[PDB]
Amino acid sequence: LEKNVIATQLSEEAQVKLEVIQSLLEPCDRTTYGQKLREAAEKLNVSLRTVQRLVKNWEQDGLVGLTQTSRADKGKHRIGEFWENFITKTYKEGNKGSKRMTPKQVALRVEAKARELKDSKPPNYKTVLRVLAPILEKQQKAKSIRSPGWRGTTLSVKTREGKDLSVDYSNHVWQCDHTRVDVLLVDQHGEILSRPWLTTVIDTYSRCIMGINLGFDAPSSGVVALALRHAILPKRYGSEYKLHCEWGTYGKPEHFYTDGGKDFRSNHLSQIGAQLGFVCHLRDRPSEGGVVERPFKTLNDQLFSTLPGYTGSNVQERPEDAEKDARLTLRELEQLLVRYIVDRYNQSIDARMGDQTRFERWEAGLPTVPVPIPERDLDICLMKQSRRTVQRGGCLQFQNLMYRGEYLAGYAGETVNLRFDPRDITTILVYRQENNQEVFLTRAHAQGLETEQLALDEAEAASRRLRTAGKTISNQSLLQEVVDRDALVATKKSRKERQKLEQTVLRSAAVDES
Amino acid sequence: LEKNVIATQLSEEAQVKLEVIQSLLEPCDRTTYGQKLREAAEKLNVSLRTVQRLVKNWEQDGLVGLTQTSRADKGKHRIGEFWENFITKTYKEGNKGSKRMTPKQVALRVEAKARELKDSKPPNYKTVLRVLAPILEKQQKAKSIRSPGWRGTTLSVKTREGKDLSVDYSNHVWQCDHTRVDVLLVDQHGEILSRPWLTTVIDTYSRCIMGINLGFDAPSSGVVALALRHAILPKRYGSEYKLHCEWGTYGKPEHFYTDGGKDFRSNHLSQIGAQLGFVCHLRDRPSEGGVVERPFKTLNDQLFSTLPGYTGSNVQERPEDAEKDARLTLRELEQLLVRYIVDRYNQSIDARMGDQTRFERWEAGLPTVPVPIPERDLDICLMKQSRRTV
Amino acid sequence: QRGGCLQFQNLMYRGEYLAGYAGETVNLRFDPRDITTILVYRQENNQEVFLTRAHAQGLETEQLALDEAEAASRRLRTAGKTISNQSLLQEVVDRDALVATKKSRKERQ
Amino acid sequence: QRGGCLQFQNLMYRGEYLAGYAGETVNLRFDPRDITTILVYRQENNQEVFLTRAHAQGLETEQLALDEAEAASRRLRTAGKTISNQSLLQEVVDRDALVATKKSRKERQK
DNA sequence: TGTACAGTGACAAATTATCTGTCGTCGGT
DNA sequence: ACAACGACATATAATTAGTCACTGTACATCTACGATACGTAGCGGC
DNA sequence: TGTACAGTGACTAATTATATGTCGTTGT
């Protein structure tokens, strides 16, 4: 084991004592000790015994023997031990759970106990503040602790299962999460809508952003599936994005690492994982998600805080003009956000390295050039209805709609896996199991509405209105209920319901991409 | 105007110059004074001309003439005006409306213009911070400005009409406003309800709390009518409140001064005022009525922050246990809050005065003891249907 | 303070030209025989620059000495200490603790 | 930093008994001929007190001198400066500023 | 002239571990 | 012959612009919305 | 060993208003 003490900058009295010690450092003759000790007593204006004591402290200890020594009672209160423990316990107990008691309130409890004990001289307010001083101080360091982070090139990710998985190359481990964007948006007229949701997908080996989905829709496994589709497929943008670089990323993960939200623990994402072959894993804590969490802070600082309609990070920062100053449509915010991610964010230097651009680290990081996946082969992203049973005459029933198709009647009594798109359920793909291998059977079409379209949400909402009204349900009556609601909304003086208008602007951006 | 300047913290070099000047205070003779200069040139390691300059700087300025004055460039920027105006106005435009542009983002706009103009020395980010520094301190100072206060027995409450009400005596001007309390309450089964609303009625002359209403109910002209009758009628509380002094406070205002809420600018309150004979007035800003707004902070600080289920003054300070740690019902919270107002708050020192309690100042401040109004004549609190036909 | 006010010996002083310095620190000089007019300085690099005279407000016309302003302040502090709530306040703070505990035992069961 | 870590010359140092001092300030002493190990001292009223040793992590085994670590640091700075806030990274800033500015629709009536 | 309470520098009074003499005692020359 | 002041040349620290290592703090679903009032327009019954 | 960017002390290079000499000139 080891120990040492070193003097800090000497005080002026300690400097003088240093000159006296140097005056007493040379001699070898008892006569010269006596001479220089007596002149040192005169120089310090002290007794001869005092100079002897000074030399002895510098002999048995360092320069810290000729600096002053602090008192033994420094940092001990002179009030009784009962009172110091009473003040300490009263403060701590006053803060259990939701309660928040101030030192002044503690002082009132001190005075109340003093009346019970008939103590004419209890600790006053300043003494209570001093007694609680270190208790309040420690707290202020514990809240501020910095984490070292990772040093680079070697990285692993802690899962909620307690397992640590390494990250070895680009597209080894993707991560994803959603946020509100801190910007208010307007419709194509200039009336306010909502703050949109931004979903990002990001590669853990390179920190390069793989894809995004920006829209008014609340988070869902459908939103995660749209974001995976954009991440995975090769990307191209028209001149209206004004890009100078290309996003240039594509291909599919080996693992997908997420929060514990229902969106990512949904059966829909699990079916996407099993078809594309990328097992999912849940993060242990939000602090393990640093690679996906931090980019939202970076976007707030570099992008969103400069745009009209900025709402601040939270209500306490909200500019009073945030609703007076909203101007961007969703299509215009996406033009800005994609220019920023392609020309700026993915072109910045990767932290934890300093040598490499984030994209260059993705591209050089690849084990091999990934083979592009044809867009039609992302029909793996369709939801599966785990079974339906082929009724007599080849019918299937699904969400109240009745479907028939080109071969189904030969399979009556079997169970088939319907695979469907929630954006348009008027046609469904039917798959069956043969030799424990799922195979394609046919496309099934909702009888009598093959020329229409219906999202699953329209069919579900119209079905509730039919059940509430007490009317029967069939393909024609369900279709009539849907087109009648859109006609009734068209009679409204605003033609607005929040979702109908947010969907109109979102769909207008979605179908302007081509 | 007068124009004086005084030196401070003189000594560090200057004591050596001061001792030189002390040795030179008198032109003793043309023969001897020159010798004193040539001797002082041993204490300062400098020529006769440096000592003659020191003596002239002393005689024309006094003690500051010993101290080295700061350079004429101090606080000026060498980058040139173009860049100093470009940086200042870029910041200001980028923090217009809802935009909140940072100095780093301003530096990016500096590099962007310098690239357009083919400049080679666009100011560095460290110098951008320095150029924007003065206009950030101003913003921080302009938020921090303190205001003094009414001092002594004289008080003139400003209305939105620009007229000031001179508050002369107890019950001359009551004031009212509403706040959420910061505690989640539970039902009699222990399940979460909501945070109550508190209404107070304060007399401006005494700052005594003349009545309250506490409930889950919404601000309404009904809640204001209930706060008024509780303020006006004599008050009675049972022993389950454990009160040790009496809320002996009652009687009718001459004026009622309020915020712009629809409870107060309403036909119902106007019909209450016309029948009680008091005039309603509108508070010009939320800072003219500190007499009503500060009691609400005192209650957070003296009462509610020390109760279970406390929610903080805002969402960023919300104790995370508030929804799990709620215990009190509305009947407990009223039994605590009424005690606090009768035993503590109305019995504490009126802060403008320092030598009266709020209640003592109210009671002594009545121009006369008012006669209690029969509870039946508080029917005026009834709403009126104006014009229905038989 | 806003409007060019300073607080000295519990009196309030209004500066003649001081309102441009609201929120700034200043330092000030006074003759103890008559504190009714006070002299205010900006502190600066090694030097104090005279900024304005400032005048006391709300006081009587007769000139006010420093010791007299202390006298008014200690007499007023003695009244506040005399009038203070005391035992009645301690009783509230105890009974407020009790009620919380009986509810406390029922912490959602 | 948490777990008893310190940053010096861009290397990360882990202290042997240091972990209880997270969020505290410490001072530190080293021999420029070899900065693989650093001596950590607590600060007090007239004295520094020796607290514990700390060792560099993630580096090569060969003993690291101070001048050599400065060199490693300027090689990183030089490499980063080759991506010289390079023009793509700024060209966006005008167009972001000019999709805005152009859209003055906040209060446009007829 | 918002307002009024919790917290905070600047200073005075009570207490104490510590510095200084003075003399006595022990050891070295 | 001695003292004071300036014209001019010369060396000098004060101030600012720039560099770089160390570090504090937000990313972590989240205020547009609920609750009154007045003011005006409308549906069928009379 | 979370994360990565805006803001910040400690130090250094560039610019400059300013103190220091040396001598000439004027007044005494």
Place this chain on the structure above:
DNA sequence: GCCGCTACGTATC
């Protein structure tokens, strides 16, 4: 054509 009860627009805490 006239009149008590509902319903929508606007403002403020």
